[model samples]
Target: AKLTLDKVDLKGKRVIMRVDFNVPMKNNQITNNQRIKAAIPSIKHCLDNGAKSVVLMSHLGRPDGIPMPDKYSLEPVADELKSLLNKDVIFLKDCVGPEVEQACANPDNGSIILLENLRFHVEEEGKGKDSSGKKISADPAKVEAFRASLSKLGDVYVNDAFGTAHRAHSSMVGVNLPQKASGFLMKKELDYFSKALEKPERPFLAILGGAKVKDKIQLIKNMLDKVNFMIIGGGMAYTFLKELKNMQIGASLFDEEGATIVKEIMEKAEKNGVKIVFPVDFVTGDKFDENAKVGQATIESGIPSGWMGLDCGPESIKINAQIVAQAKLIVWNGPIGVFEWDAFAKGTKALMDEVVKATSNGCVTIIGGGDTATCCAKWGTEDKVSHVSTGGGASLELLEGKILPGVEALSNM
Candidate 1:
């Protein structure tokens, strides 16, 4: 177990926190402030516990180590946080340097400092492009110097960026501090994931979807050992149906490479006593367009040529709902259909409704990040579920049973 913020003494200490402030933007305006909002509890904890000052650092976008302040600045986020915290937030122009260190030293009690994008320097990522768009790697000496400079700005290090935990970037592991701990958000994410992965309530159900079976093969293999039932849907379902049932999935997504492991996947699931479920019927589309003509077909009547399966039909939705109702724990990743379009959203919508209902009945429902996270936001069911993950790639890596570099860097209890 890793040490959390509550385990440390914040009194008279300068806390350097790595937070995920990577909110979506449009014309320099934040479209979603969820990521920013998620870090508030930890920030507040530091101040409320009488910390000398709190220095926040984060990366916005892929600035390629160039100082593109207009596009990747944290100034807007500082303003937003100021309003949220109802206090003055000193926004720094840079992440590391003598100037930044001086500002963080001996600040007033409970002062909040928001540092500029860490990705402004190539040293943070260790590699990026030069001004002329030529690829360049940061000097090892410079990287060590940068880390030394960063370590000077804090008495304690707290990482609240669960979204970027998978990355082994400088900001994630470079901070040399004795009390390297996790913030409240990181602790909560770990708690929920541990509940589902380590000792989930039975019968545990895993709902896996997305475009390619190859991408989710690790997730499937890992989940096969834990879950009592696994629902395979989305475009990848066609590959399973075609390979195993020999059903014609004309023009539908056919994974030529993923098909090679169909028999192996089934055999492993059978050996583990795990039930594998697939869509028995589908909502077929003549073309992969929003306004495409829609049709229906079942496993008995294979999808015809010139048509592709876009969504699950009513029968498939019903089966999924029944399985969800019986599940004590459910981890949903990826949308079962192209939920972005209204035409192909029913299957996902219906399953979401069932999961929400199950949550009300005391089921542990975890919505994995990415498209499924968007689904919860679209339907306003984020609060209704047990936990909605904030990190897409981070959560996927965790579910795949990989150790996150950021999480691993924290001091253990």
Candidate 2:
């Protein structure tokens, strides 16, 4: 099991929690608050456990280590939280130094406070590689000095921000060591993922999609021994199709560099008895623009010239549905196509429905990554899956058996 959150004490003490309010902010309005809403369970748990107050920390868009109007603010999120949670919500303009120390200095139970973006400081990024290959702190003594001071503000640290679990910020890592535990949300996500990947029963199937092969390079190489079957979708499938020479991938996103490496991965899968399935057909497009009338073409031979493969065709959906139908354990990431447009979303929608149905029939299905999560939510099948990962790159990295910088720092605790 993953590290448990319930082990930590919260009774009548301040709880400094690093949460991700990293929602899309545009024109001074939050475009989406999914990230913020996801932290509620943990916040409520803290209240139930009698935490004196909760200082929520977060960072939004890169600010280049200082306030930039375009990126300057967590004010929008703090204001939104005022309406979302009925607790006493206070906003702090800074996340470090004396102001933060005072913000948590002795507050009432269940009180909610938010700190400004942590990315506003240059030290948050850490110094370049040090002499022994460690990331040197911008000011080693000063950061720890600040860390020691901040530790007094809270008796416990709860990190509910999985989205930033891969980062190396002070709140994300430096201040959390020896004082941190998973927030309820983080504990649950990690528990489910760690268990699902470890002892998955037979017929373990994985669906991988999205536009880049570089991002999944490690996953493909690592999961070969863990899964029995794999189905590839989205733009990157073209690279596999290109490998088998089953498509003329003209102008579709291609990585010639990864193409060579993928060939070896495929051969490795073959040696391991892994069934690697590529799309048998594609929904072709002439351009990468928003609207490109997609049509089904036989992927058995190849997709033709002047047409970019934007989505899986009807055949792939039909076949992948059958594959999902029989999977005892399943984990899916990425989209089946350019699902942003209604016209090209059929394939993704179909697969989403299939996964929901499969899960309903006793398959343990996990869906991860941001785009895939959005697609599942849009298709109204998100809740039907076994577990939907809260962190995109974090979950992907975990699936590849890699340690997150933030998590590793905390693990050292």
Off by over 4 Å in 2: 1-3, 69-72, 127-142, 145-149, 176-178, 411-413
**lDDT of all predictions:** 0.92, 0.77
- Per residue, candidate 2 scores C-alpha lDDT tens digits across 1-413 of 23445766678878888887888767899866778888998888888888888888887886655554355789888889888886558888887777778778987667888888776665666544443555444777766775666566677777788888877777777774355777777766676678767888679998888787877888888788789999888877888887776567766788777787888888889998999888787777777767775655775556566668888788888999888898999988888888998767788989888898888899998888488887766666767888777788888878888776665544322
Report the C-alpha lDDT of model 1 over 67-120, residue by residue, as the tens digit: 999889999999999998898999999998778989997788889999999999
Q: Return the lDDT, model 1, position 383.
A: 93
Q: Report clash pairs, candidate 2.
A: 246-302
- List all candidate RMSDs to the true structure: 1.5, 3.9
Clash totals for all candidate models: 0, 1
- Candidate 1 — which pairs collide? none
Estimate TM-scores for all models.
Answer: 0.96, 0.90
Model 2 TM-score, all chains together: 0.90
